[PDB]
A paper describes a structure:
Because these binary complexes were solved at high resolution, the weak head group densities likely resulted from their lack of interaction with the CD1b molecule itself.
The human CD1 family of antigen-presenting molecules (CD1a, CD1b, CD1c, and CD1d) is structurally related to MHC class I (MHC-I) molecules with the key exception that CD1 proteins bind lipidic antigens. The unusually spacious cleft allows CD1b to capture either two small lipids or particularly large lipid antigens.
Residue numbers in the entry:
A (entry chain A): 4 to 282
B (entry chain B): 3 to 101
Amino acid sequence: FQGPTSFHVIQTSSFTNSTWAQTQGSGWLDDLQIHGWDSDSGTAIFLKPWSKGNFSDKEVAELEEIFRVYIFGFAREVQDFAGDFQMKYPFEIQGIAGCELHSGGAIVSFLRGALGGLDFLSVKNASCVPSPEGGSRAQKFCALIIQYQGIMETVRILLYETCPRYLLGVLNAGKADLQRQVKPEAWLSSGPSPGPGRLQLVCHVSGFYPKPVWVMWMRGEQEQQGTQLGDILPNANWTWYLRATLDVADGEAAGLSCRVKHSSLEGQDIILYWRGSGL
Amino acid sequence: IQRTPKIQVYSRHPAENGKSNFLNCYVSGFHPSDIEVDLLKNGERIEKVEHSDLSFSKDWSFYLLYYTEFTPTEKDEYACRVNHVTLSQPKIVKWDRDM
Ligand SMILES: *[C@@H]1O[C@H](CO[C@@H]2O[C@@H](C)[C@@H](O)[C@@H](O)[C@@H]2O)[C@@H](O[C@@H]2O[C@H](CO)[C@@H](O[C@@H]3O[C@H](CO[C@H]4O[C@H](CO)[C@@H](O)[C@H](O)[C@@H]4O)[C@@H](O)[C@H](O[C@H]4O[C@H](CO)[C@@H](O)[C@H](O)[C@@H]4O)[C@@H]3O)[C@H](O)[C@H]2NC(C)=O)[C@H](O[C@@H]2O[C@@H](C)[C@@H](O)[C@@H](O)[C@@H]2O)[C@H]1NC(C)=O
Ligand SMILES: CCCCCCCC/C=C\CCCCCCCC(=O)O[C@@H](COC(=O)CCCCCCCCCCCCCCC)COP(=O)(O)OC[C@@H](N)C=O
Ligand SMILES: *[C@@H]1O[C@H](CO)[C@@H](O[C@@H]2O[C@H](CO)[C@@H](O)[C@H](O)[C@H]2NC(C)=O)[C@H](O[C@@H]2O[C@@H](C)[C@@H](O)[C@@H](O)[C@@H]2O)[C@H]1NC(C)=O
Ligand SMILES: *[C@@H]1O[C@H](CO)[C@@H](O)[C@H](O)[C@H]1NC(C)=O
Ligand SMILES: [Cl-]
Ligand SMILES: [Cl-]
Ligand SMILES: [Cl-]
Ligand SMILES: [Cl-]
Ligand SMILES: [Cl-]
Ligand SMILES: [Cl-]
Ligand SMILES: [Cl-]
Ligand code: NA
Ligand code: NA
Ligand code: NA
């Protein structure tokens, strides 16, 4: 099927000093935000009418309270253990947890944590695995967290039992938005000169959904291997933008075209033709 | 180690003077998360700007999208202004139709 295949929650907990800490959070289907989190109130924000998936109001409220207690509790516990862990303020902790649907139908769950923008820990087989970058500190954290069977069990249930049924429920509930097809528009421009006697030609592709797209500089039916793809950039309203560039000598730009293939075009590729001397 | 933001400014549609469009500013690769982003019209802050909630990539670097609806003209100048702990003063990246 097309569109996102995973769901994840992210946490960014910023510890300014011994008395001040704040956490930002959100829920996502791949790169598409479906939940917000109010840092102040500790309540979820449902961004889409189908953001609760097939979960009842009861179960959604239960999970919000799990996250509310966890988020408040996490800052409380990090502040209390900051001395023992030789933490210098300010520091920032990040976490990502969720699950994903694979080809063949298996659903795989993950949980990763970071400290100072570096990998700190991960969860494999419902256990705390310290990352090498986390050093002795991540080894001490995994020793501490496994002492508390309450946290371990709650994490296991959320990762391996709650997330998979939530994912299937929300992919279904959101299909009118997630599996829609939006056509790209494309245009050509001239980039900065990459070197002596050379031009840079740019093929812009914008407004497409879903994310998979194919863009190549061509000479007839021949793909130009020099084609450089920029990073896929977001647009507002769940669409994407991409630039495909080509470095050529001035006298060799004639005969070039840019070809765009996307699921929404139903086989009718977009073809733009470069024409010389400002035509 | 703190990472300074990368700033990319681009329009949703090819610019055509007098035609409705969207100006995007994608701020990425920064750490820590605290950041200030503004979109400017002739150096003046645009009040009706929308933005994504904080997210991060696989290397844990943060990213945000700030966008506003705009109509390009021959003379109106647009830019994205960002402040972060890694910078002494706000960094300004001007929107360029030809770049
Ligand atoms: C939200 O949706 C989830 C997914 O639902 C399915 O997909 C969506 C998109 C729609 O198309 C739905 O109509 C469709 O149901 C729901 O979770 C799914 O629930 C079903 C039960 O309805 C459940 O099926 C059962 O599976 C077990 C076996 O499960 C084990 O083994 C499989 C591999 O084989 C493995 O993948 C699992 O993880 C487990 O290890 C099976 O024993 C059951 O059989 C019994 O019931 C059937 C009739 O249903 C009967 O014919 C049999 O004879 C026998 O009595 C049954 O087939 C799915 O496994 C489950 N999917 C996941 C990923 O968990 C979800 O339902 C709720 O959670 C379920 C876990 C279960 O408690 C339900 O009763 C709950 O309502 C739904 N709602 C919520 C709130 O999550
Ligand atoms: C429908 C929309 C939503 C979609 C569904 C979302 C599916 C989510 C998918 C993945 C999430 C994984 C969750 C990881 C967060 C930890 C949760 C927790 O332990 O929380 C508890 C923990 O809270 C604390 O005690 C604070 C301690 C936190 C510090 C621990 C930090 C460690 C966290 C990382 C775990 C790594 C270790 C992995 C080993 C298995 C608090 O919960 P509680 O039940 O105790 O609260 C009770 C509440 N019901 C009413 O009172
Ligand atoms: C992955 O997690 C499994 C569940 O916790 C592990 O099995 C468990 O092994 C424990 C031994 O320390 C034991 O207490 C558990 O009761 C048992 N769980 C089950 C499924 O009954 C699993 O590896 C096991 O342990 C190793 C040492 C061998 O005895 C294997 O045969 C077991 O499967 C974990 N696998 C890892 C860590 O790679
Ligand atoms: C702690 O951090 C907060 C948040 O930035 C700050 O306003 C406050 O002044 C700090 N407290 C002290 C006493 O340094
Ligand atoms: Cl605090
Ligand atoms: Cl330590
Ligand atoms: Cl798994
Ligand atoms: Cl940090
Ligand atoms: Cl064109
Ligand atoms: Cl428009
Ligand atoms: Cl706007
Ligand atoms: Na517009
Ligand atoms: Na203008
Ligand atoms: Na351009």
